[PDB]
Design a protein around this nucleic acid. Structure first.
Lengths: 137, 53, 191, 127, 75, 141
RNA sequence: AGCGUGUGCCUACCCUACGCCGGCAGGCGCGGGUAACCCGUUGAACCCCAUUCGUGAUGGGGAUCGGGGAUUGCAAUUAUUCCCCAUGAACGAGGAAUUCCCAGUAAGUGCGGGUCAUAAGCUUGCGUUGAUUAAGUCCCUGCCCUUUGUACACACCGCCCG
């Protein structure tokens, strides 16, 4: 019933409003489906609807939970970055920030010159896979 | 004496053979027979494994 | 159930194959009414026997096509039962009569065979047997319903009803009807 | 590596823990934190046995002048886990035919020696 | 082709279209409502359950998979 | 109605609701977060679902001599999509079912059975039979 | 539901129900079983169904990669494997070609055995759900059947001219 928004922005990504929230959110880097599904459940929303629907209120409420998940009965195992290392975190990286950390991690083991690093640098593979017949195109 | 001379043999292909012929390949381990398939073919009559269908 | 052996709930009696010759590989039930379009059914051993098989079930079987759908008869039976209901809403009648009619109307009377013809192989107009007419019709309608249903919101039961109804009175809206006319048109030339 | 600033200035905290703190426990208390694969390896390794190696490390750490790097310590233990006890040393890490020489930066922590000595050769399609 | 884009929230006037049309159709399912309007499919659904209110439309089978509705109960 | 008399979906539907009204069941604080099976795609749409499982289990036990969590994990366990590999069984969680089993005990619906496995209690046996009747009574239809 | 399976073993070791902890993965405590006794009325999976989605490569698809949890092993780094999250590819029906198939058969669908310490996308059976379709013929193909021709006979993949 009612209307409004089409086209809403959360933290630095444009989120189609027509779309269902859970699914709508999953545009954001780092919000997969299992994520966004649990975030919303935490965030009190009538699950039954469209991202374009809902309030500015509910939105901050989704974001707030999304970047402090631990602080909301979201378990750490649900999380993208456990065990940081550099800080020994736990974390759940989000948005533009996932591309960032991906870069870091690759750099880290390229500095250290570890074979994986090298593989990434030449643009081959790093898990143990045969490289004779595939990934050719 | 030569502490030198062994590394684990507990498990894997390397931990077993053919009671008949040493071969560590294609080994029948079912029912505890432990015969390589090539041998088992030649001894299946004397063991009591007979063709019916 | 005891009064008369209806269909899911539809009467076998009073449905008449309005088309001489076809009479009889369309198997309603010149006594055979049952209850459900599912049976143990051994049709395969003999060449003919299939004719015995209730046309309804025959239609249901053709429904479960495409590798994924093979063997899903329960699904087809469910679809068939729904289709009959939709057809009935659409015109009263016996949907089974509607089904029979579509089948009678769709079998290509005439067809063509690829006669060797020397070179530029020409095609010979030949008449088509009634078993083939039945067999071919049920395909046409099923392939018709299945093809339509695939990228559209509409369900097979619905698309089936649409194919069946249009065919019952040959609207030519139907894929099958257009196909049959195409096969027949081809038969006539060649000769 | 002792006094205000002097040398120091590369930092690095491992798991919230600081390298000052890192360099001061027991390998025990380090593997305790987070790493999980490396820790199981050392426990199960255990009994443990790269004993002599670790003494070879400290030895050459000593004999090294007073400024820099020094001589290195060879090994075939690819499956060894880098722990703060090691950091600052120089490891000849065998790959099948070569011993690649690698200083272990504090970042490496929790990683396996093998990850810093590539066995295979990139390759070739054209050339 | 067939690219389908759907109005996924009620627009008043589209609420009027619903109750002042759907009594027109003999067959109504999700698809009908979708094609004949430009309803979401999701908001088709909710319109079906609502329509069955005390009905504009009447149930003849809502097989899990499918509702199948008829015109309202006229002459 | 014996519980056996009522259809499984309505029985479970009615009992699960009855439990909801009673207000005292108890609930790993989680239940918001949990999937219920590794096989699982998403958690349960009805976040309210803890009750439904409980009802389902109570009914499940009443039927049979005694059952335990492993069986339930498998029962709940569906097929898991290996992706590249073909699909296989994967018995569903053990925390939820266990908690369900522990919680039910609190109400006394079920009690530890002899030789392992939880069995329905006469208290539960009575309780299920009672709701079973209510469901049968509602209506024809 | 079904074919099948197990420890107390040619030399190190089993199948595992049940209580607890953990979201999971799994961890941990028990207790039976040389088995038609126990695991296992194999309470399987398709499927059936009450909902959601709504025809958007989307919720179809699950590639690749990042981080992380655990299991096997003395040792897994060149991921043994499994899980959890994240990143969320091509692919929207397949040209030239071409395999296989007649009734529990094709096809969907799970299970068990072999490999095995760990490891299944495999092979190798098994039940479950279960059609369409010839019911024949020698056209193509393949092989044997006569008759016939042959400078062939290491046999046409043969014996030839400048």
């Amino acid at each position: 019933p009612e209307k409004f928004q089409h086209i809403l922005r959360v933290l630095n990504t444009n989120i189609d409003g027509r779309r269902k929230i859970a699914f709508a959110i999953t545009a954001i880097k780092g919000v997969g489906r299992r994520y966004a599904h649990v975030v919303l459940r935490k965030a009190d929303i009538d699950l039954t609807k469209r991202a374009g629907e809902l309030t500015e209120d509910e939105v901050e409420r989704v974001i707030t939970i999304m970047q402090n998940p631990r602080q909301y009965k979201i378990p750490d195992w649900f999380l993208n970055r456990q065990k940081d290392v550099k800080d020994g975190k736990y974390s759940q990286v989000l948005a533009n920030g996932l591309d960032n950390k991906l870069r870091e991690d690759l750099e880290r083991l390229k500095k250290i010159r570890a074979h994986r690093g090298l593989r990434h640098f030449w643009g081959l593979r790093v898990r143990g896979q045969h490289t004779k017949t595939t990934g050719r195109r | 004496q030569q502490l030198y001379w062994s590394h684990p043999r507990k498990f894997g292909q390397g931990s077993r053979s053919c009671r008949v012929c040493s071969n560590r390949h294609g080994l029948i381990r079912k029912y505890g027979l432990n015969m390589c398939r090539q041998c088992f073919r030649q001894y299946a009559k004397d063991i009591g494994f007979i063709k019916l269908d | 159930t005891p009064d008369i052996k209806l269909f899911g709930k539809w009467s076998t009696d009073d449905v008449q194959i309005n088309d001489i010759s076809l009479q009889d590989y369309i198997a309603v039930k010149e006594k055979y009414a049952k209850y459900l379009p599912h049976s143990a059914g051994r049709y395969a051993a003999k060449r003919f026997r299939k004719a015995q098989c209730p046309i309804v079930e025959r239609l249901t079987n053709s429904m479960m096509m495409h590798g994924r759908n093979n063997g899903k008869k329960l699904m087809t039976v469910r679809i068939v039962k729904h289709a009959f209901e939709i057809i009935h809403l659409l015109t009263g009648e016996n949907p089974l009569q509607v089904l029979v009619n579509a089948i009678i109307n769709s079998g290509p009377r005439e067809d063509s065979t690829r006669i060797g013809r020397a070179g530029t192989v020409r095609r010979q107009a030949v008449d088509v047997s009634p078993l083939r007419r039945v067999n071919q019709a049920i395909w046409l309608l099923c392939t018709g319903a299945r093809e339509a249903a695939f990228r559209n919101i509409k369900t097979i039961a619905e698309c089936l009803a649409d194919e069946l109804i249009n065919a019952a009175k040959g609207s030519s809206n139907s894929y099958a009807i257009k196909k049959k006319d195409e096969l027949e048109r081809v038969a006539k030339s060649n000769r | 590596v002792e006094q205000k600033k002097k040398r120091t200035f590369r930092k690095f905290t491992y798991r919230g823990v600081d390298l000052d703190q890192l360099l001061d426990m027991s390998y025990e208390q380090l593997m305790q934190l987070y790493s999980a694969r490396q820790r199981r390896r050392l426990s199960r390794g255990l009994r443990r046995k790269q004993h002599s190696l670790l003494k070879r490390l400290r030895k050459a750490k000593k004999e090294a002048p007073p400024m820099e790097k020094p001589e290195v310590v060879k090994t075939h233990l690819r499956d060894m886990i880098i722990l703060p006890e090691m950091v600052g040393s120089m490891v000849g890490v065998y790959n099948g035919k070569t011993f690649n020489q690698v200083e272990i930066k504090p970042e490496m922590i929790g990683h396996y020696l093998g990850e810093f000595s590539i066995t295979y050769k990139p390759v070739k399609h054209g050339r | 082709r067939d690219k389908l884009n759907n109005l996924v929230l009620f627009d008043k006037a589209t609420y009027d279209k619903l109750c002042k049309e759907v009594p027109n159709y003999k067959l109504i399912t999700p698809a009908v409502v979708s094609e004949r309007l430009k309803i979401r499919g999701s908001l088709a659904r909710a319109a079906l359950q609502e329509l069955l209110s005390k009905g504009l439309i009447k149930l003849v089978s809502k097989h899990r998979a499918q509702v199948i509705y008829t015109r309202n109960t006229k002459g | 109605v014996t519980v056996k008399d009522v259809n499984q979906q309505e029985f479970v539907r009615a009992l699960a609701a009855f439990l909801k009204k009673s207000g005292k069941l108890k609930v790993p604080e989680w239940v918001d977060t949990v999937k219920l099976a590794k096989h699982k795609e998403l958690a349960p749409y009805d976040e309210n679902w803890f009750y439904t499982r409980a009802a389902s289990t109570a009914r499940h036990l009443y039927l049979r001599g005694g059952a335990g969590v492993g069986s339930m994990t498998k029962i709940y366990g569906g097929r898991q999509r290996n992706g590249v590999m073909p699909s296989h069984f994967s018995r569903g969680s053990k925390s939820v079912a266990r908690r369900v089993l522990q919680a039910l005990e609190g109400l006394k619906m079920v009690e530890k059975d002899q030789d392992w496995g939880r069995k329905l209690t006469p208290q539960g046996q009575r309780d299920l039979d009672r709701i079973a009747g209510q469901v049968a009574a509602a209506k024809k239809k």
